[PDB]
Amino acid sequence: VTATAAQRIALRNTATNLSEQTQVYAQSATAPTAAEAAIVQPYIDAAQAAITAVG
């Protein structure tokens, strides 16, 4: 409610990218190696940065 439009739209922007990037873990149950974890990690941080600062 108090949050501006930029934060509200970023909430969806980060969530969409995180959902798109995480889809790989639903097709298989094999644990990933350190190479893919490093590539996937920044999206989690970005999603956390948008979950915070909006409440």
Asked if residue 55 lies in contact with residue 11, where contact means CB atoms within 8 angstroms, the answer is no
Nearest to 47 by CA among 4, 1, 5, 13: 13
Side-chain-side CA neighbours of residue 11 (13 Å):
11
Asked if residue 14 lies in contact with residue 46, where contact means CB atoms within 8 angstroms, the answer is yes
- For 43, other C-beta atoms within 10 Å of its C-beta total 17
Method: cryo-EM
